[PDB]
Amino acid sequence: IVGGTASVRGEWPWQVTLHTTSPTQRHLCGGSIIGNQWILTAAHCFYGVESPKILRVYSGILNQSEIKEDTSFFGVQEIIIHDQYKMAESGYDIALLKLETTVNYTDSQRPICLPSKGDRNVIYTDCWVTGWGYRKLRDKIQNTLQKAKIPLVTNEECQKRYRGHKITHKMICAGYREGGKDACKGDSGGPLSCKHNEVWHLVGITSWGEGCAQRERPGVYTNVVEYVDWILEKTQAV
Ligand SMILES: CC(C)CC(=O)Nc1cc(-c2ccc(C(N)=O)cc2C(=O)O)cc([C@@H]2C[C@](C)(c3ccccc3)c3cc(C(=N)N)ccc3N2)c1
């Protein structure tokens, strides 16, 4: 996160850190708890992820340094990547992780509501991007979970900012005209969370952008509302 500040413990209880175990304990991507055995994240995070066996999902974490040998985690039973996914810049940058065990909800770990298809018309004015990603282009993964408040940008305005790309309605952009606050490397897969009528909704999944926090280059996110049907298809399969 560029231009963010440290989160307080329990502030974003749906935020998870997805780790890889080889050769050592390392953060891979962010993710969001959406159900008691379901994490929503980005498809691009998974290149080179051959088997779900190398994954560990950690919830209720503020600092990466908390991650101890005896820290509880969730194993991943399955990785479900959208079948139309090719690359972040072309969309369909979404994936589900089915957990091996159930998350027991607490003040430190609980789900975020999906947007309502009937909420595709709502205007969110209180949106935050969170993560352990870089604070600048050439950096490293952060210890403390960072947060940044960013305004949503209309699809039409975002398309003006990325004239050489196709910004679809399955993408949502967020950023300040002058730049300064944005997601960056390591933040992908994590949430773009918006508060509406006292309820937090998972509006976006951190995906891509042209650099980080640049003037007139908003961050591009997977527009979760456009995937509610896909999510239900995968999570509610008979
Ligand atoms: C070798 C090639 C195949 C490259 C490859 O591997 N791609 C790849 C790998 C990573 C990556 C690497 C390591 C770790 C880890 N955990 O160490 C985690 C990640 C991670 O997923 O974030 C990231 C991306 C992009 C980068 C991008 C566009 C960007 C462009 C320019 C500079 C910085 C960032 C960006 C911008 C914004 C924003 N400004 N809103 C949001 C998301 C992203 N994500 C692609």
Task: State the structure-solving technique.
Answer: X-ray
Look up residue 149 and give its two tokens.
Answer: 């408040």
Q: Which two tokens stand for residue 25?
A: 């304990």
Residue pair 134/212 in contact by the 8 Å Cβ criterion: yes
The tokens for 146 are 């960072």
Which residue in 214, 181, 228, 217 sits closest to 2, CA to CA? 181
User: What number of other Cβ atoms are within 10 A of residue 161's Cβ?
Assistant: 20
Q: How far is CA 105 from CA 70, 109, 114, 157, 193, in A?
A: 19, 6, 17, 39, 19
Strand partners, 20: 26, 55
Structure's resolution in angstroms: 2.8
Pocket probe for ligand 1: among 130, 145, 185, 205, the residue whose CB has the most ligand atoms within 8 Å is: 185
Contact between residue 206 and residue 129 where contact means Cβ atoms under 8 Å apart: yes
Residue recorded with tokens 């490293």: 140
* 236 Cα–ligand 1 center, Å: 31
Ligand-binding annotation for 162, yes or no, is yes
Residues forming beta bridges with residue 18, ordered by sequence position: 29, 57
- Asked whether 184 lines ligand 1 (CB < 6 A), one says yes
Neighbours of 223 (CB within 10 A): 23
Q: What is the CATH code for 13-111+227-238?
A: 2.40.10.10
Residues 6+ apart with CB under 8 A from 149: 126, 127, 128, 181
Residue 93, ligand 1, Cβ within 6 A = no
- CB of 95 shorter than 6 A to ligand 1: no
Q: Is the peptide bond before 218 cis (omega within 30 degrees of 0)?
A: no
d(CA 114, CA 72): 26
Type and span of the H or E element at 39: strand 38-41
The structural domains of the chain, with segments of one domain joined by +, span 1-12+112-226, 13-111+227-238
CB contact burial 99-138 (16+ within 10 A = b; e otherwise): beeebeeeeebbbbebbeeeeeeeebeebbbbbbbbbeee
CATH for 1-12+112-226 (2.40.10.10, 2.60.40.2890, 1.10.8.50, 2.30.30.110): 2.40.10.10
The answer to whether the 1-12+112-226 and 13-111+227-238 domains have the same CATH topology is yes
CA angle 235, 78, 35 (to 5 degrees): 40
Residues 6+ apart with CB under 8 A from 104: none
Return the structure tokens found at 127.
């949106």
| Rg from Cα positions in the chain | 16
Please check whether residue 143 is in contact with residue 17, taking contact to mean a CB–CB distance below 8 angstroms.
no
